[PDB]
Amino acid sequence: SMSYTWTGALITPCAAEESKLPINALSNSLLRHHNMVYATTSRSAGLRQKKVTFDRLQVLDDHYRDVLKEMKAKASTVKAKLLSVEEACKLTPPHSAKSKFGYGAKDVRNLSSKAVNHIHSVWKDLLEDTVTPIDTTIMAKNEVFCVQRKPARLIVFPDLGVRVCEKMALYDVVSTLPQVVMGSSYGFQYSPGQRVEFLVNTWKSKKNPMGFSYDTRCFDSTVTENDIRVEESIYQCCDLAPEARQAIKSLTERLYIGGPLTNSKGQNCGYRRCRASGVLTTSCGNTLTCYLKASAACRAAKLQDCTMLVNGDDLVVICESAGTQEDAASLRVFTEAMTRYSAPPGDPPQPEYDLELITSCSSNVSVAHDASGKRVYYLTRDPTTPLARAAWETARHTPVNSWLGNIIMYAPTLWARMILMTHFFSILLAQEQLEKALDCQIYGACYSIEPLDLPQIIERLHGLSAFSLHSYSPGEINRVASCLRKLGVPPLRVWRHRARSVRARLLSQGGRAATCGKYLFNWAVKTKLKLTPIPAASQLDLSGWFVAGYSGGDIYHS
Numbered sequence: 036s037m038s039y040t041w042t043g044a045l046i047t048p049c050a051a052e053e054s055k056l057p058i059n060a061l062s063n064s065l066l067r068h069h070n071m072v073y074a075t076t077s078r079s080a081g082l083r084q085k086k087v088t089f090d091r092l093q094v095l096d097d098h099y100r101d102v103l104k105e106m107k108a109k110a111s112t113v114k115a116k117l118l119s120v121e122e123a124c125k126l127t128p129p130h131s132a133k134s135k136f137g138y139g140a141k142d143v144r145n146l147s148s149k150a151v152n153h154i155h156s157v158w159k160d161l162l163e164d165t166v167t168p169i170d171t172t173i174m175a176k177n178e179v180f181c182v183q184r185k186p187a188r189l190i191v192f193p194d195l196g197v198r199v200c201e202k203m204a205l206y207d208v209v210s211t212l213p214q215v216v217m218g219s220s221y222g223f224q225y226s227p228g229q230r231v232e233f234l235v236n237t238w239k240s241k242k243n244p245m246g247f248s249y250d251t252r253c254f255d256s257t258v259t260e261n262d263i264r265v266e267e268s269i270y271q272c273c274d275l276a277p278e279a280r281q282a283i284k285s286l287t288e289r290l291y292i293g294g295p296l297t298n299s300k301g302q303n304c305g306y307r308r309c310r311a312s313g314v315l316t317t318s319c320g321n322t323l324t325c326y327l328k329a330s331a332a333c334r335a336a337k338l339q340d341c342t343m344l345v346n347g348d349d350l351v352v353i354c355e356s357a358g359t360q361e362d363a364a365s366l367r368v369f370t371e372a373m374t375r376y377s378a379p380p381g382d383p384p385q386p387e388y389d390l391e392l393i394t395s396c397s398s399n400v401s402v403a404h405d406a407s408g409k410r411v412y413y414l415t416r417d418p419t420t421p422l423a424r425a426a427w428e429t430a431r432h433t434p435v436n437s438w439l440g441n442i443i444m445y446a447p448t449l450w451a452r453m454i455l456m457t458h459f460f461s462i463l464l465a466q467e468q469l470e471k472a473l474d475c476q477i478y479g480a481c482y483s484i485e486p487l488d489l490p491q492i493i494e495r496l497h498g499l500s501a502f503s504l505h506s507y508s509p510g511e512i513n514r515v516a517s518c519l520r521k522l523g524v525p526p527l528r529v530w531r532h533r534a535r536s537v538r539a540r541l542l543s544q545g546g547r548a549a550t551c552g553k554y555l556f557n558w559a560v561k562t563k564l565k566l567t568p569i570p571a572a573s574q575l576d577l578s579g580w581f582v583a584g585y586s587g588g589d590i591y592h593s
């Protein structure tokens with residue numbers, strides 16, 4: 036079956052679309068090569084439509100069914116609950132697309148009778164109708180990138196009322212099942228640090244460790260009706276209220292498997308027979324399907340001690356190496372086996388015998404030293420993307436403050452400390468918006484965060500070491516350095532000279548700011564400071580921050 040069928044109608048833009056980095060008075064204090072940064076618009080949607088329209092073909096051997104059985108067993112221990120409507124509402128993102136039925140996210144969160152009535156009636160349609168396809172909207176995504184240009188990705192999502200419904204039936208499922216079914220291998224249960232510790236222990240649990248990541252060529256399009264249905268047999272293994280089983284069956288037949296795509300102007304763009312990105316089960320399902328296809332594939336290729344870490348469509352496999360010549364052979368089979376499951380490779384996975392050489396979730400493990408000179412591991416990455424965006428957001432406020440999200444998730448990184456924290460705090464001082472809560476996204480979910488809190492938040496996601504790390508490896512430093520030369524970002528020495536000033540600015544502010552300049556820039560000075568636990572750091576409520584991803588699921592918290 037073809038992943039997609041087009042009618043020829045264009046995927047139209049809902050609003051104005053900028054493709055060129057806006058420039059303001061602050062711009063050059065960060066990135067001088069403006070011709071390097073751009074944003075994807077609905078103008079390239081046609082390209083993307085071409086790269087993802089293809090026919091999927093699957094050959095499921097016993098190794099495939101073997102693993103699927105194991106998973107269903109563990110799945111059978113899960114007892115998901117049926118969210119009521121109010122609860123559902125209370126999980127909808129304050130800035131989530133409004134309903135084509137007269138009410139919006141603001142309406143739903145508050146439980147206005149308009150939204151609650153409609154949802155109650157949408158849910159009923161799911162219980163007495165298990166076939167009529169549910170309409171969807173297809174818009175091109177606007178993401179910023181560096182050149183050397185990729186076509187805009189495609190977002191497909193059902194109406195707000197249906198989204199609320201998905202939660203009532205699946206919210207509790209997608210949060211639980213993954214951990215239970217895949218155990219430690221489930222990547223959305225780890226904070227950046229725990230992810231790093233998991234990969235290290237796992238690397239140490241091998242006499243001869245050998246690893247590789249596996250990138251699927253546009254994974255959503257590879258996903259076939261069979262996958263969507265198998266996913267369901269898995270969900271249906273849970274102890275689920277009867278009404279929920281129906282809704283999950285109904286959502287499956289009428290939505291997740293496929294359905295008509297409607298552009299922003301109401302025209303028909305075509306039909307979908309693969310994964311919809313805007314559904315509650317997108318992240319969970321992918322991860323589920325990706326884990327199943329890569330476990331079978333492991334056995335198919337006789338890989339010794341197959342351990343895996345799976346975050347949605349991203350895959351990492353650390354096993355017991357059996358000889359450099361023997362591994363490259365194994366991986367060939369593995370790729371071939373994945374290809375038979377409709378999970379071909381975008382790039383040939385290649386074996387690495389060096390941990391800090393594998394890239395999962397666009398990141399990697401690297402090393403430095405804490406306050407005690409002890410070797411400590413942290414999660415870092417190429418800063419190209421993060422900065423390019425931090426730049427765009429320097430002259431354009433976005434719904435997703437990437438620079439903040441980035442700082443929270445990469446506090447320990449050489450580039451996030453010297454550049455991101457400095458640059459942006461400097462700007463918060465001038466505007467005096469040091470406490471204005473701002474949105475940002477982590478593993479998918481949108482959180483509201485106040486800048487002055489960062490000190491506590493960071494300590495809570497990485498620990499005190501995120502303020503005293505030093506002697507970063509030469510490999511990392513050189514990468515941060517190069518990327519800067521590329522985008523035209525001033526050298527690191529310049530930033531330290533600026534952080535020295537921003538530190539001083541924050542310190543003078545006393546209070547929570549004084550804490551910020553105290554802990555966030557304590558690396559800019561020579562006479563280091565004490566830095567001890569933060570009293571209100573143990574106050575923060577971070578249980579639900581990293582229990583499950585919701586990328587393309589309509590999720591929000593505090």
Ligand SMILES: O=C(O)[C@H](Cc1ccccc1)N(Cc1ccc(-c2cc3ccccc3o2)s1)C(=O)c1ccc(Cl)cc1Cl
Nearest residue numbers: 448449450452453504505506507508512527528531558559
């Ligand atoms: O230890 C390191 O890896 C870097 C190495 C490094 C090298 C080049 C550019 C940036 C970082 N470094 C070591 C140094 C800190 C200050 C240095 C220095 C020497 C010097 C001489 C004259 C004028 C200013 C100067 O700053 S070297 C740091 O103290 C440091 C640690 C964490 C963070 Cl977030 C930032 C820094 Cl600066």
